[PDB]
């Protein structure tokens, strides 16, 4: 029993995007499908709802220009299309089941994984990966190491240390925007004996650019 | 346009403790729902019609209220319950609360700070970044100051913060100072300075070129 949404998109401003919710494990036509928008750090915003069987629709007034909702009963799929995309439009969009299908508002019982939508003119770029090793002031019981990942688009990248083997004391920070583009850092802290005596490596993977990179950290 | 407010907006609790989350509305109903969102996850419904548990929700979750005030109560809190909670009203077209984030109390901890000069690799490509890590500290509130040759430097700083650690309940912070290779060479002393309530006096880290 699930809702599966389409993969994340990167799109350009003034274009249109269409996202899909595919319903399984229940009767698609008896339940309303609702759509919701979540910007980072912001409140959930309701977009509108569709009755898959009819499918009649009800819209948040704000979204009447932006969003078109449609249902295809034969495939158990619901769609959202969003037009004239602008930056304020970037968000994660969720589709959810709510009540038995009737024109009433409900609480939303099940949610899809959600579809990240990015609206940008920035060009897909791979991260530059830079090793952070000490000066070194030295010296102490445990030692802290990092890599700085810079200028990549689009989100997201995954960071790993020692090919994931080593995850005690890893901190990976949320990416922040620096331009067209995105920057993040990650730190690792290990027993001071441990490095430089044996190797510590940053692993960075960026799906959007089909790139994976490994930076070993060498003492400065 | 009904409006939903959750006023107290972070809450602290100890595993096994009980905590209550408040929700206000700008007009009446019995139509209220409560939701749980873990970061990077979709919301999961906990409670509907104000007091009714959704399927699968454990019993330590209860919800109460009617009209304009509502409460979500979680007792015997588990580590897995640390997260975001918001309400939604369906009396009129749905509007949601801002949400409340739940945090675990712990022993105060001072940050371990580490500072890093720009890598040769960045320098060769013509940029410089100086990174300061402030790691494993509680409580959450903190200040970081960048100083170049004795002077406080406010622009060029970008900041990132982690969510509270699942394993030890500490917080972590990252600070990046980005300079052209040219002012970087221009100055000699670079320092990351942290002041946290665990100490009256800042933990200071520096390097000289």
């Amino acid at each position: 029993v699930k809702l599966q949404e389409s993969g994340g998109e990167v799109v350009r401003p003034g274009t249109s995007v269409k996202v899909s919710c595919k319903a399984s494990g229940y009767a698609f036509t008896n339940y309303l499908i609702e759509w919701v928008k979540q910007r980072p750090g912001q409140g959930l915003e309701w977009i509108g709802v569709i009755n898959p069987g009819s499918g009649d629709t009800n819209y948040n007034e704000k979204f009447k220009g932006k969003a078109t909702l449609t249902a295809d009963k034969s495939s158990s799929t619901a769609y959202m299309q969003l037009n004239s995309l602008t930056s304020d439009d970037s968000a994660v969009y969720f589709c959810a089941r709510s009540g038995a299908a009737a024109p009433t508002y409900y609480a939303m019982d099940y949610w899809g994984q959600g579809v990240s939508v990015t609206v940008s003119s920035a060009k897909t770029t791979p991260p530059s990966v830079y090793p952070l090793a000490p000066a070194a002031a030295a010296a102490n019981s445990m030692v802290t190491l990092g890599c700085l990942v810079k200028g990549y688009f689009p989100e997201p990248v995954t960071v790993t240390w020692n090919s994931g083997s080593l995850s005690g004391g890893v901190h990976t920070f949320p990416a922040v925007l620096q331009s067209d583009l995105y920057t993040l850092s990650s730190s690792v802290t290990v027993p001071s004996s441990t490095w430089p005596s044996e190797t510590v490596t940053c692993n960075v993977a960026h799906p959007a650019s089909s790139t994976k990179v490994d930076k070993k950290i060498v003492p400065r | 346009d009904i409006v939903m407010t959750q006023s107290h907006k972070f809450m602290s609790t100890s595993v096994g403790d009980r905590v209550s989350i408040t929700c206000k509305a700008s007009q009446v109903g019995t139509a209220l729902a409560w939701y749980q969102q873990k970061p990077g996850q979709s919301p999961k419904l906990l409670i509907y019609w104000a007091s009714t548990r959704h399927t699968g929700v454990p019993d330590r979750f209860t919800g109460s209220g009617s009209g304009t005030d509502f409460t979500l109560t979680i007792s015997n809190v588990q580590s897995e319950d640390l997260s975001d909670y918001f309400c939604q009203q369906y009396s009129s077209y749905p509007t949601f609360g801002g949400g409340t984030k739940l945090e675990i109390k712990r022993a105060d901890a001072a940050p371990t700070v580490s500072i890093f000069p720009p890598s040769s690799e960045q320098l060769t490509s013509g940029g410089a970044s100086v990174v300061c890590f402030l790691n494993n500290f509680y409580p959450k509130d903190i200040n970081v100051k960048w100083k170049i040759d004795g002077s406080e430097r406010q622009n060029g700083v970008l900041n990132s913060e982690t969510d509270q650690d699942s394993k030890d309940s500490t917080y972590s912070m990252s600070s990046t100072l980005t300079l052209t290779k040219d002012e970087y060479e221009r100055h000699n002393s670079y320092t990351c300075e942290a002041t946290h309530k665990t100490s009256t006096s800042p933990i200071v880290k520096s390097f000289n070129r």
Binding site: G99, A100, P103, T104, Y105, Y106 | G29, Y48, W49, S91
Partner: peptide, 9 residues
């Protein structure tokens, strides 16, 4: 569309 309800089973 308009009013508030449920759930049913």
């Amino acid at each position: 569309p308009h009013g508030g309800s449920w759930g049913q089973p």
